[PDB]
Design a protein around this motif. Sequence first.
Motif, PDB file in Angstrom:
ATOM      1  N   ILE A 266     -16.380   6.246  -1.554  1.00 15.10           N
ATOM      2  CA  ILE A 266     -16.675   7.654  -1.501  1.00 15.10           C
ATOM      3  C   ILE A 266     -15.741   8.327  -0.488  1.00 15.10           C
ATOM      4  CG2 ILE A 266     -18.512   7.333   0.200  1.00 15.10           C
ATOM      5  CD1 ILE A 266     -19.967   9.681  -1.193  1.00 15.10           C
ATOM      6  N   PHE A 267     -15.235   9.451  -0.854  1.00 15.54           N
ATOM      7  CA  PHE A 267     -14.305  10.295  -0.094  1.00 15.54           C
ATOM      8  C   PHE A 267     -12.875   9.795  -0.069  1.00 15.54           C
ATOM      9  CE2 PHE A 267     -17.811  12.824   0.608  1.00 15.54           C
ATOM     10  CZ  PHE A 267     -18.858  12.185   1.258  1.00 15.54           C
ATOM     11  N   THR A 268     -12.552   8.898  -0.976  1.00 20.63           N
ATOM     12  CA  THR A 268     -11.199   8.444  -1.267  1.00 20.63           C
ATOM     13  C   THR A 268     -10.986   8.402  -2.761  1.00 20.63           C
ATOM     14  OG1 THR A 268     -11.511   6.041  -1.320  1.00 20.63           O
ATOM     15  CG2 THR A 268     -11.209   6.945   0.829  1.00 20.63           C
ATOM     16  N   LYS A 269      -9.722   8.299  -3.156  1.00 22.64           N
ATOM     17  CA  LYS A 269      -9.359   8.136  -4.517  1.00 22.64           C
ATOM     18  C   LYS A 269      -8.094   7.317  -4.589  1.00 22.64           C
ATOM     19  CE  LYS A 269      -6.584  12.368  -4.896  1.00 22.64           C
ATOM     20  NZ  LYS A 269      -6.683  13.852  -5.207  1.00 22.64           N
TER      21      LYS A 269
ATOM     22  N   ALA B  17      -4.736  -4.355  -7.516  1.00 26.32           N
ATOM     23  CA  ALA B  17      -5.574  -3.615  -6.607  1.00 26.32           C
ATOM     24  C   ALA B  17      -5.102  -2.165  -6.481  1.00 26.32           C
ATOM     25  CB  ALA B  17      -5.618  -4.303  -5.247  1.00 26.32           C
ATOM     26  N   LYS B  18      -6.007  -1.324  -5.982  1.00 28.14           N
ATOM     27  CA  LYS B  18      -5.773   0.102  -5.769  1.00 28.14           C
ATOM     28  C   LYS B  18      -5.405   0.382  -4.340  1.00 28.14           C
ATOM     29  CE  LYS B  18      -9.812   0.699  -8.870  1.00 28.14           C
ATOM     30  NZ  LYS B  18     -10.123  -0.773  -8.750  1.00 28.14           N
ATOM     31  N   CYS B  19      -4.535   1.410  -4.160  1.00 28.18           N
ATOM     32  CA  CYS B  19      -4.375   1.965  -2.830  1.00 28.18           C
ATOM     33  C   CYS B  19      -5.320   3.162  -2.755  1.00 28.18           C
ATOM     34  CB  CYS B  19      -2.921   2.391  -2.600  1.00 28.18           C
ATOM     35  SG  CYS B  19      -2.709   3.021  -0.918  1.00 28.18           S
ATOM     36  N   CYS B  20      -6.337   3.137  -1.929  1.00 23.84           N
ATOM     37  CA  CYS B  20      -7.295   4.201  -1.783  1.00 23.84           C
ATOM     38  C   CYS B  20      -7.074   5.000  -0.511  1.00 23.84           C
ATOM     39  CB  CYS B  20      -8.700   3.635  -1.778  1.00 23.84           C
ATOM     40  SG  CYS B  20      -9.115   2.578  -3.202  1.00 23.84           S
ATOM     41  N   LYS B  21      -7.162   6.321  -0.635  1.00 30.31           N
ATOM     42  CA  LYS B  21      -7.149   7.176   0.502  1.00 30.31           C
ATOM     43  C   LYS B  21      -7.771   8.542   0.142  1.00 30.31           C
ATOM     44  CE  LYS B  21      -3.042   7.873   1.084  1.00 30.31           C
ATOM     45  NZ  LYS B  21      -2.804   8.490  -0.234  1.00 30.31           N
TER      46      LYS B  21
END
Length: 36
Positions: free
Chosen positions: A19-22, A32-36
Motif C-alpha cells: 500500500i502506497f507504492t506501485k 520481481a517488481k521495483c516498488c515505490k
Amino acid sequence: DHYNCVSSGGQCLYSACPIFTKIQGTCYRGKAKCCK
Ligand SMILES: [Br-]
Ligand SMILES: [Br-]
Ligand SMILES: [Br-]
C-alpha cells in the motif's frame, strides 16, 4: 533491474507492491517488481 531499483529509491519485491507504492521497475531477471 535491482541496481537501478535500489539506486533510485525503490524496493525489489516478488509479491504485490505494498500500500502506497506501485510498480516502477523490475528486478531479478524480470521476476520481481521495483516498488515505490
Ligand atoms: Br531491495
Ligand atoms: Br503490484
Ligand atoms: Br528499475
